[PDB]
Amino acid sequence: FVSNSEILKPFEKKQEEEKKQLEEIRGNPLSIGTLEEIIDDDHAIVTSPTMPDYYVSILSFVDKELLEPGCSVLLHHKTMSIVGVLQDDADPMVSVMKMDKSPTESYSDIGGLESQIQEIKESVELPLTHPELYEEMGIKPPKGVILYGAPGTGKTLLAKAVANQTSATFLRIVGSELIQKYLGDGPRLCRQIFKVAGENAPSIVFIDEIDAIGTKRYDSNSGGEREIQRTMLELLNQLDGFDDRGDVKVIMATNKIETLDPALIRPGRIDRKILFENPDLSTKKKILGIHTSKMNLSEDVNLETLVTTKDDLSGADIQAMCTEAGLLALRERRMQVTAEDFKQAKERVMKNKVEENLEGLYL
Amino acid sequence: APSHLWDIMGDRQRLGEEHPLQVARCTKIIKKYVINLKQIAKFVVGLGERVSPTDIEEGMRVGVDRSKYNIELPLPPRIDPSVTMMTVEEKPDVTYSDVGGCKDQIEKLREVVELPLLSPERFATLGIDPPKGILLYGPPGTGKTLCARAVANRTDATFIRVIGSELVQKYVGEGARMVRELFEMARTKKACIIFFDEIDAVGGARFDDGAGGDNEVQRTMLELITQLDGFDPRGNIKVMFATNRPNTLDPALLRPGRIDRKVEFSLPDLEGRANIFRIHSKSMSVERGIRWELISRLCPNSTGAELRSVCTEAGMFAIRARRKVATEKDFLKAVDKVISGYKKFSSTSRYMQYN
Amino acid sequence: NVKDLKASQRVCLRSDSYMLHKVLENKADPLVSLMMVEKVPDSTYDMVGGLTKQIKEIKEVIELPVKHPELFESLGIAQPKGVILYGPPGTGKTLLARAVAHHTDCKFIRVSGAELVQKYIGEGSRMVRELFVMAREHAPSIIFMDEIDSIGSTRVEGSGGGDSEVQRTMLELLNQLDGFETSKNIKIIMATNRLDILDPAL
Amino acid sequence: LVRDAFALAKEKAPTIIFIDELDAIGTKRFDSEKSGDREVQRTMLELLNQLDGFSSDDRVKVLAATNRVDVLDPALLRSGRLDRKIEFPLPSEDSRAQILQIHSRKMTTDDDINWQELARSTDEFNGAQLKAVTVEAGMIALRNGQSSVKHEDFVEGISEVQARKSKSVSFYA
Amino acid sequence: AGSKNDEVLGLLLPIAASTDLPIETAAMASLALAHVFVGTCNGDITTSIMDNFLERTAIELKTDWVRFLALALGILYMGQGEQVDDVLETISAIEHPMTSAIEVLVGSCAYTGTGDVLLIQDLLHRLTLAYAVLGIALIALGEDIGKEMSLRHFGHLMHYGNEHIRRMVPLAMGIVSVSDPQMKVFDTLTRFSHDADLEVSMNSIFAMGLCGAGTNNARLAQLLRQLASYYSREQDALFITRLAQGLLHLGKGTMTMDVFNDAHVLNKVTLASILTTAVGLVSPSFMLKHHQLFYMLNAGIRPKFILALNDEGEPIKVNVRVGQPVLLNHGERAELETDEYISYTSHIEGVVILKKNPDYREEE
């Protein structure tokens, strides 16, 4: 009664009078354009998609902080005055960006790697989940981790489980997409990658399978060897010269990182170097049980029998046999996969599917 | 709430026929002003009401009315580039005392940059010329960029950091415009500092044979050298060149007169690496009675980036090893971890001397 | 009202009053630069002779989990990502990819790796993986790869053919389907000539 | 830009157009597949044609200054454009003594410095390296607090790092 | 604070009746007597306070010492229950504008912890005074639902035409946010940090130290450093801005002040500090006052700790992984976490006892 007269009454009166002004303020066409620069006198310059040029005064419904060079604002029809700023919704630019929310992964499927998980979990998941450990101690967590090892160890699933527990933005940058056909777009792409990751949350930056510049192999994209440095050094300047408090976490992994320029690795920012090797007979027993957990197995099929047959195989080679054994029984359409299918599946993977070279051997 | 106070002026600053101004540039001045529009159209007009005859200058953006063209208000030139507006930073986090060590490489930079800005009358007595440019390269990982942000803190003025890949654009010839964007603000904003990061991807002397496209990069330096040392000796502020590859740089770029003070970072010795752990001892947790001179002595000569990783990892042993605070035992484990354990790639440590 | 209005809709904008009048039509199926949209082709199994032995290989492998998604889900395995053919060009290996899309009632879409790289503001690298979105809104995709390598028309018979960048990128995008959407409706159909043309990662 | 430059040069009197850093113009070679070119070549063709047919008679004169002649257009040098070939060898003993002394005209010294003595300490230095000697000499007096630059400041300025100078507690015995 | 003594009836009681507040600015012991009896009232202490409002002469019309006596009755009658209505009827006998500020304070202290529609509407009607807004955030502490929803009711208080109400808005935000810092609270205090009225910005500074209680700086790093531009504009901005900055580091950053715990017990000692120091922080704040009013915060400091003993105080080591410490033993602190062993009674932080079973026993 008393408060409603001093709150609801003056508020509803000002809102109705404000809506009456919106007809004279915001016209029917409401032209827009691109903002170039702003001046402290409340006057700016806006360029419409038809490329005109005008100089007007900055009106209400906007502040000095909301105005940024290169944005889009709202104009007027006859007077061409700036009505206000128009925020950009439905992602900043690209809708296919790898940014997602809470993917599906757990720690049970990545089991067996816990020796290598403890290092990456403390440097990535720990400061995001429990920030009070690094902030109260005074130490600064590393700005990223790097992975190296033999192909097939399943380095992709190591960082996939981090995005689920952190429940934050998770980005992926393909190493083969770093370069571009047109010269000069290489650093323009990498500049927009850290720009989006820096605006919303510390998030995650994960780069996998970098073939860039390595042993050429792209004759349809010509950089002239000058685009090599400009594209790669752009990633280096964002991990060093760019001012950051340690929020941005950039992860790089591929088959062989030795061919890359060690200056691009930027030592001292990445304090975690994780190596991956082939698991032994004890670890493969736990990995085999993971892929066969959701699989229906017969009574004669033993997990310890298939592990003994496996020799010089990575984590990806174990899942290949479980997938091939399911396809062999799929042709006969059996509910429970018998033991004869696993015997024929393990032989075809290590023969036709997996080609084992000599490399360094000397028996 | 703030919009209601500005609606009173809406009957003037909005409905007026003045404000709808067409921005253009005056090509020719006759003392009749030939002014070229953005639509590729030109006209000739005189002065305005409040327009002063000395305000209009050759090659300056001048706004005119949309209906009947007449000069109304002048505007600052070079309105097209939006790129250099974001290059100016504000209040870098790295302070002047963040660089570890008493090394004299700090005293050389403050006298050629901070001294003429703070005390311009000190060198005016002897009538000398302060160094225009400087040189900082060093091996990667010595904290060279920390010294660049340390000078900007004491300067308390405009600081510009230019990326080596920012100068080269997606068109041929636009990189020449990028150079004039930097030096134009030098006359507009006095007593500022420009900085170049990774100038190797910029710097020329790539010769010719066999690539066929190397002439696009060298034209950026030919514009950069011309805008730096031209016919008219135009210069005010200090120019900083920084890269990790001194070998691939233009040997003419390294010649003096565009650069005077040359400071190359080196590996800190036992006394140099001692202050690196002392400046980090104020942070984290250090047990009372631990001598950091023995820790830096066991660690061989390496870059400063790997020295801060020792203190970072030293605090990480207490989690797995079940410790309260970082002790001397956990410090010895970091020597075999940060240094001896990481010896496989992922590092420089005097790896690249030239290329 | 605004309930019947959505993105990419051709409408009629009045002149004097500067207001919306009505809706004319929608946006055409082909988008961006070059978009190949073919739904329910005319190629069937009867049009392909002598490959019946190989038709059973592209049926119980490719076609089977598409029609019956509950098979590999019950068996505990994962749906196959992609299948590549090894043979000489011009023998009709592309016809087999268009014939299987008819029986599965899908929309056949090719991939030209030459035009996937353009230059715009924010769209520069979007065009490479833009074909992934076109397989999102429409689940029956069965993406097919075109412009494999040099058959002796163009030059550069050795080194790479440019497909190694697009093929390995599209296959990596399949991890987001099972990780986030938890369903994979996208399948990459590839082809080549020799065995050693592919990268060792594939 | 080239056509409009020489178009006014007739009405603007023999302004003697000066062009610096010619390394950007004069490259030709050939174009096969990658390494896109010919966009710069169109600028060269205007420089060659304007200085031949319709100009370069009396009031049209152009001075060109480049860095290295290893890469340029062999057709750019012609009796109708560039006649005299001028080389600037490194200054001699008596030549460096005069150059170093002129840069000190704006400084304050006791006139006890022997510039011919400093010329012998400078071995094969260009005109740019000579100017840096007077700059370093002024910085030594600031740290030492000297009210005037003496002779040992120029000698110590050479020992300081400018060109071909390293020191920094490095002794090979 | 927290102590109870019956010897104050012969020392501080007769001094408070000297009516030295409007003249000599003395006889402030009413604030001292509030810390004596906590949760209970007194007949002689309350009577001596009402005697100051009984004369209501021209000398007593000053508004500076009005709320000094109200804080005395607010602490004594805090949590009184249904017996607060009998006291409000006695105060309502004397009709003076000073009685409006007493009823909105003492009345809100007894109902603290329970939300009510009639109690909130009565506090909003008195705005057209300082503790009338703080009474809404005080009674909403006991209800976690009404605590988070009170943020939207605070932003609606800017509809008034007077700036004295707007400057009191951020003071209520620090009461509900004193436990844990929130992201939505930081966005609201940003608007009050920049204003033409200095009293609006200074009150928002003191609210930042209360909301960030329990830590040093999280999102407040750039917010406290944004106030560096106000040092040259106002000379009083030097002490006020740095006063709330020390509250985040109070007790070396480990100590804090909160009315909540694992047992959900509201502490009247902490409420006797923040509520008394909110209004009249410094001399230029609100009306003319002194610099001695903000020292009440030292009596409500509650440190966080975890400790284990056996019988006579022999130290026993536990295992608790928290922020620095990770896997502590003895003489450290912890929050919202226990050990892997079996405690005795509290099963929470602080000083506890460990009792091990003969089946599974793991010790040092």
Curated annotation (Swiss-Prot), chain A:
Keywords from the named record: ATP-binding, Cytoplasm, Isopeptide bond, Lipoprotein, Myristate, Nucleotide-binding, Nucleus, Proteasome, Ubl conjugation
UniProt main location, coarse: cytoplasm
Tagged with keyword Nucleus: yes
GO CC entries: cytoplasm; nucleus; proteasome complex; proteasome regulatory particle, base subcomplex
Domain of life, per lineage: Eukaryota
Binding site for ATP: 149-156
Cross-link (Glycyl lysine isopeptide (Lys-Gly) (interchain with G-Cter in ubiquitin)): 160, 181, 216
GO BP: nonfunctional rRNA decay; peptide catabolic process; positive regulation of protein catabolic process; proteasome regulatory particle assembly; proteasome-mediated ubiquitin-dependent protein catabolic process; protein-containing complex localization; ubiquitin-dependent protein catabolic process
GO MF term (any one): ATP binding
Sections of the chain in a coiled coil: none
Protein's cellular compartments: Cytoplasm; Nucleus
Family the UniProt entry places it in: Belongs to the AAA ATPase family.
Function: The 26S proteasome is involved in the ATP-dependent degradation of ubiquitinated proteins. The regulatory (or ATPase) complex confers ATP dependency and substrate specificity to the 26S complex. Has ATPase activity.
Protein's recorded name: 26S proteasome regulatory subunit 4 homolog
UniProtKB/Swiss-Prot annotation, chain B:
GO cellular component, one term: nucleus
Protein name per UniProt: 26S proteasome regulatory subunit 7 homolog
Taxonomic source organism: Saccharomyces cerevisiae (strain ATCC 204508 / S288c)
Transmembrane region(s): none
Residues annotated to bind ATP: 138-145
Native organism taxonomy: Eukaryota, Fungi, Dikarya, Ascomycota, Saccharomycotina
Alphabetical keyword list: ATP-binding, Cytoplasm, Nucleotide-binding, Nucleus, Phosphoprotein, Proteasome
Gene Ontology molecular function: ATP binding; ATP hydrolysis activity; proteasome-activating activity; ubiquitin protein ligase binding
Quaternary structure, from the entry: Interacts with UBR1 and CIC1.
Signal peptide: none
Keyword Phosphoprotein on entry: yes
Curated annotation (Swiss-Prot), chain D:
Highest taxon of the lineage: Eukaryota
Compartments reported by the entry: Cytoplasm; Nucleus
Modifications the protein undergoes after translation, according to the UniProt entry: N-acetylated by NAT1.
Record-stated family: Belongs to the AAA ATPase family.
Free-text function comment from the UniProt entry: The 26S proteasome is involved in the ATP-dependent degradation of ubiquitinated proteins. The regulatory (or ATPase) complex confers ATP dependency and substrate specificity to the 26S complex.
Protein name: 26S proteasome regulatory subunit 6A
Native organism: Saccharomyces cerevisiae (strain ATCC 204508 / S288c)
Gene: RPT5
Full protein: residues contained: 262 to 434 of 434
Swiss-Prot record, chain E:
Cellular component aspect of the GO annotation: cytoplasm; endoplasmic reticulum; nucleus; proteasome complex; proteasome regulatory particle, base subcomplex; proteasome storage granule
Domain of life: Eukaryota
UniProt KW Lyase keyword: no
PC repeats: 1-25, 26-66, 69-101, 171-202, 203-237
Listed GO biological process terms: proteasome-mediated ubiquitin-dependent protein catabolic process; regulation of protein catabolic process; ubiquitin-dependent protein catabolic process
Repeat among keywords: yes
Keywords: Phosphoprotein, Proteasome, Repeat
GO molecular function, one term: enzyme regulator activity
Extra information: Present with 306000 molecules/cell in log phase SD medium.
Role summary: Acts as a regulatory subunit of the 26S proteasome which is involved in the ATP-dependent degradation of ubiquitinated proteins.
Entry's family note: Belongs to the proteasome subunit S2 family.
Name recorded for this polypeptide: 26S proteasome regulatory subunit RPN1
Species the sequence originates in: Saccharomyces cerevisiae (strain ATCC 204508 / S288c)
Gene: RPN1
Span of the entire protein shown here: 498 to 993 of 993
